[PDB]
Write a protein that binds this DNA or RNA. Structure first.
Length: 164
DNA sequence: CCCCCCCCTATCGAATCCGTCTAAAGTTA
C-alpha cells in the first residue's frame, strides 16, 4: 500500500522549519512509521530573510539544522536527503562550471555525499531530446563520475552503458 | 573584580551586408 505510508508536511518559514525538524520528525521516527526524510528545498526559506550582511545568524541556523539532522539520522539509522538550489559563479573546486550550490561552505561542511543533477539545455537541444546528467561531486568512498538518465511517464530511468 | 571570539551574495546584455554573367539565327526571282 503505497500512498497510505507517505507523510506530507508543509512549512513556510525558517523558524517553522526548525520547530518542525525539532519536535515532529523524532515523533514519526520513534514509532517506526517512517525511516526516510526528504526536504524538498533547504535554500528556499533561507534565501528570503538573511541578506549579504547577516551571515552570522544564517550560519548559526545552518549549523543547528545540520547537527539536529545528523543526530536524528545516526540515532534512527534513517537516510536524510536534501534538495538544494544553485547560484551563479561570478577555490572550492568549481572552476569550469557556471553554477554552484547555494548555501555555501558552512552548509557544505555538514554533508556526506554530494550529487549534482544537471540538464544541458543551451546546447545539444536541437537533437530533439533533453540531455540530463547526474554527477557525483564528493563522497568518502565514491570516485567522481557521472551518468545519463531520462524522465518518462513511469519514472526516472538511467541509460545503460554511459558511466564516466 | 579577573580573561578571550563570527561571517557570503547575486546575472547582464545584440551587432553587421556583399558581389555580375552569358550570343543566336537566312530569306525570297
Amino acid at each position: 500500500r503505497f500512498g497510505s505510508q507517505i507523510f506530507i508536511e508543509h512549512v513556510a518559514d525558517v523558524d517553522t522549519l526548525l520547530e518542525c525538524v525539532n519536535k515532529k520528525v523524532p515523533v514519526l521516527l520513534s514509532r517506526g512509521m517512517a525511516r526516510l526524510v526528504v526536504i524538498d528545498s533547504v535554500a528556499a526559506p533561507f534565501r528570503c530573510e538573511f541578506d549579504s550582511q547577516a551571515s552570522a545568524p544564517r550560519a548559526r541556523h545552518l549549523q543547528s539544522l545540520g547537527a539536529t539532522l545528523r543526530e536524528l539520522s545516526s540515532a534512527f539509522q534513517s537516510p536524510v536527503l536534501c534538495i538544494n538550489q544553485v547560484t551563479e559563479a561570478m577555490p572550492l573546486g568549481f572552476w569550469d562550471e557556471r553554477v554552484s550550490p547555494a548555501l555555501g561552505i558552512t552548509w557544505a561542511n555538514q554533508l556526506l555525499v554530494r550529487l549534482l543533477a544537471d540538464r544541458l539545455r543551451e546546447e545539444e537541444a536541437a537533437l530533439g531530446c533533453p540531455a540530463r546528467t547526474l554527477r557525483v561531486l564528493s563522497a568518502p568512498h565514491l570516485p567522481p563520475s557521472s551518468c545519463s538518465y531520462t524522465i518518462s511517464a513511469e519514472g526516472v530511468r538511467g541509460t545503460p552503458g554511459t558511466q564516466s
